[PDB]
Write a protein that binds this DNA or RNA. Structure first.
Ligand SMILES: [Mg+2]
Ligand SMILES: [Mg+2]
Ligand SMILES: [Mg+2]
Ligand SMILES: [Mg+2]
Ligand SMILES: [Mg+2]
Ligand SMILES: [Mg+2]
Ligand SMILES: [Mg+2]
Ligand SMILES: [Mg+2]
Ligand SMILES: [Mg+2]
Ligand SMILES: [Mg+2]
Ligand SMILES: [Mg+2]
Ligand SMILES: [Mg+2]
Ligand SMILES: [Mg+2]
Ligand SMILES: [Mg+2]
Ligand SMILES: [Mg+2]
Ligand SMILES: [Mg+2]
Lengths: 85, 113, 94, 200
RNA sequence: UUUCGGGGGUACUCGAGUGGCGAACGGGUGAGUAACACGUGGGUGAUCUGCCCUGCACUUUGGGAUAAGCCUGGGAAACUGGGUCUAAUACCGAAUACACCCUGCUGGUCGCAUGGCCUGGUAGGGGAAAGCUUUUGCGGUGUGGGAUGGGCCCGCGGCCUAUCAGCUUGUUGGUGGGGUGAUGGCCUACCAAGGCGACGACGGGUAGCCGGCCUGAGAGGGUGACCGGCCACACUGGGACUGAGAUACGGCCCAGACUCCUACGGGAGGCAGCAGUGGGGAAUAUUGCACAAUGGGCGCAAGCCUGAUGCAGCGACGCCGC
């Protein structure tokens, strides 16, 4: 609040938080939908939504919102869940 | 970035510098990765020594010289060599070695006798 | 003129993990044994050789080492809190 | 600082010639003051102390600087007493006195301090400057015709010149072939007592 | 261009603003901490790393906004709303990538058990980009290697106190999930009943640690000012956000104490940066001068910024010389 650059950064940090929050929410909804599909037991729906969720995880790592290793962990867990169930 | 810097040694009004490889963020008089040379500007010609084998390695891996260190690397020919440009022999000047003390003692002996 | 599209990594020698020998004092946890290691150090001031004992928790998958047995161990990454050793070989059963 | 008080009273207390040309000493070889005649109780500490006082009040070195000389001598690889004596002998005011260009070590100090000598072509006015092997000591042009220095030219003979020194010219040019060994040094003092004093 | 009140154009230039990078370094202090904090030696087949260096591939294609501007509202102030409008290397969708990420099958090989390697082979699915400049021209994206900077784990080492003997129930271990860059009760559900302790557990007291320094014949004792390396904190306590990276000193949010402003509705602060003031005390300095040198940030560069720093002022405070 004292330094000009910091005052500007207040505005810019907020803009980025909103962008990241929105993306993370979308990812979380997608993973939730897949989980519900697997707990319902519907191999077909579950497989279709695994592929869309997986690509969404990858794209979130491209925007820098999540780390690539975190995307790999999420993708791996989902795919293993579909193979087991 | 890893850089080639001058670190200040010596006392007041007598700046003596070691040529060191150090991370940009490290404070001037901080821990260095290597000492590859020294530079004494108060002399005439200013004293310059560089370990050319290490300077070539560090420039090879991408160490970025500071402005004065780049001037020194050109005097020594280590810059021209690293790039491939000519002038690798360099134009390093060395202080004329003063007369030996024993010879001046013999001179005084002969002169007076 | 063109360089290679793949650059292979330089060879690094794989490090030396520590090893030890001890005796099993406990096997009451699942897949874990407690092993006592013995060390001999010279006392800093008095110079007498002093014998000291350190308990260690080691991982064994199959429960092949029971209480009282002599076993060899090797360091490993953390497998849980405490556990940092794996059982290599049950060396002399008793 | 310097000691600038009476010079005879110091030799009288110590019972030995320091300047060595002093008539008032030979007239009254006893210590000074009212009680200078009286009997003094013997002690080893007084003997050791007075040998140190003879050294430092001969060469004109303050106790602080003299103690640094001791530590260097003891640090040096030779035997401490020899090293200490030849260090004090290396002093430029002493070298000037041994060369003969001065009458007293006090006069030698003043001359060196006032800027009348050069060593290897560079002016030196530091009396404690320690000469080294193959030093050449010369006189600046202005001081060559200087009236007391003229006296010094034609007063050669007061004392003998030691072998490590050599005056080679009428310019009064001094050469130092080496540092003096204990045999070369000739001083009215038992150096072993000073080494013992500082081991207390 | 003039009438001389002003009014246009240019973009050399540049206030405010959008955007990028920096602001996590550098500087301070030693409150807390008896701990993998520190020192020394290892481990990572359990990992991250902006900018820099050096291979390979590429840099296709569309879109919707908004700050600034202009009109206007609310408020004492701090600030803030609505409308209209504009641009990008700001933001967003798709193609391509098959080096890379995920999954199934399968071959060889090296070990140190998980495993590692052969960018192994193979099938299926998926992951980017940005332009500017006309000049020593600078940039953008993925990916291989390097360099640098880290993270985490472990052996050994350095205080007093049993007039401190038992402590512990996520606590010790296991499996299925979650979480992280990564391993791991790190988290969580269930299951087993373990784990640490007179080789002083759990308590209490004190304390940042070290290279070193002082003393000493040495062994030892004492100590950690300056200088140099780590750590910790930034009015007190808690929290996360942005980012390659955060104890975020001159960032943000909340609660508390204190100071200040107010129109009483509500606002605004944080010298353990440099200098300086009050206070406490036996006692410790100038509200200097420069970026000329060295180091750092941004910029293609000229350059700009730098109380880092280089120097100056004051005190026999110390050492040395005269
Ligand atoms: Mg997982
Ligand atoms: Mg003095
Ligand atoms: Mg501007
Ligand atoms: Mg900081
Ligand atoms: Mg962009
Ligand atoms: Mg797991
Ligand atoms: Mg404390
Ligand atoms: Mg003793
Ligand atoms: Mg982040
Ligand atoms: Mg502040
Ligand atoms: Mg900040
Ligand atoms: Mg201050
Ligand atoms: Mg007071
Ligand atoms: Mg500079
Ligand atoms: Mg330039
Ligand atoms: Mg400024």
């Amino acid at each position: 609040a004292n330094i000009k650059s910091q005052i500007k950064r207040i505005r810019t940090n907020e803009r980025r938080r909103l962008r990241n929050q929105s993306v993370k929410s979308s990812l979380r909804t997608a993973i939730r939908g897949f989980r519900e599909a697997v707990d319902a037991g519907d191999k077909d729906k579950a497989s279709e939504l695994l592929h869309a969720t997986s690509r969404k995880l990858d794209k979130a790592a491209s925007k820098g919102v999540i780390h690539p290793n975190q995307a790999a962990n999420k993708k791996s867990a989902l795919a293993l869940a579909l193979n087991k169930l | 970035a890893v850089k080639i810097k001058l670190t200040r040694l010596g006392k007041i009004r007598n700046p003596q510098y070691r040529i060191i490889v150090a991370d940009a963020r490290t404070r001037r008089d901080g821990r260095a990765i290597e000492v590859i040379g020294r530079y004494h500007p108060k002399e005439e010609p200013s004293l310059i020594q560089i370990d050319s084998e290490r300077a070539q390695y560090w420039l090879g891996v991408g160490a970025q010289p500071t402005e004065p260190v780049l001037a020194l690397l050109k005097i020594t020919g280590d810059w021209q060599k690293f790039k491939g440009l000519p002038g690798a022999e360099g134009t390093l000047k060395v202080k004329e070695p003063k007369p030996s003390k024993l010879d001046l003692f013999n001179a005084a002996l002969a002169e007076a006798e | 003129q063109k360089g290679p599209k793949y650059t292979p990594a330089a060879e690094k020698p794989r490090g030396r993990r520590k090893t030890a020998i001890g005796y099993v004092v406990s096997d009451k946890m699942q897949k874990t044994i407690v092993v006592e290691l013995e060390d001999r150090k010279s006392h800093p001031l008095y110079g007498k050789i002093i014998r000291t004992t350190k308990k260690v928790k080691a991982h064994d998958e199959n429960g092949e080492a029971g209480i009282g047995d002599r076993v060899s161990l090797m360091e490993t990454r953390p497998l849980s809190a405490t556990k940092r050793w794996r059982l290599v070989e049950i060396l002399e059963k008793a | 600082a310097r000691y600038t008080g009476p010079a005879t009273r110091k030799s009288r207390r110590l019972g030995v010639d320091l300047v060595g040309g002093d008539q008032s000493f030979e007239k009254r070889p006893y210590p000074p003051g009212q009680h200078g005649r009286a009997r003094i109780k013997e002690s080893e500490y007084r003997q050791q102390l007075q040998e140190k006082q003879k050294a430092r009040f001969s060469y004109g070195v303050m106790e602080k600087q003299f103690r640094r000389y001791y530590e260097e001598a003891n640090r040096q690889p030779g035997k401490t007493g020899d090293n200490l004596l030849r260090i004090l002998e290396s002093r430029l005011d002493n070298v000037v006195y041994r060369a003969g260009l001065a009458r007293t070590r006090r006069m030698a100090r003043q001359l060196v301090s006032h800027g009348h000598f050069l060593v290897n072509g560079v002016k030196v006015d530091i009396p404690s400057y320690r000469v080294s092997q193959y030093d050449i000591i010369d006189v600046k042009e202005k001081s060559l015709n200087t009236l007391p220095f003229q006296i010094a030219r034609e007063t050669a003979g007061e004392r003998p010149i030691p072998s490590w020194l050599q005056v080679v010219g009428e310019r009064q040019r001094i050469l130092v072939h080496q540092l003096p060994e204990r045999a070369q040094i000739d001083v009215p003092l038992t150096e072993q007592l000073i080494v013992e004093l500082y081991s207390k």
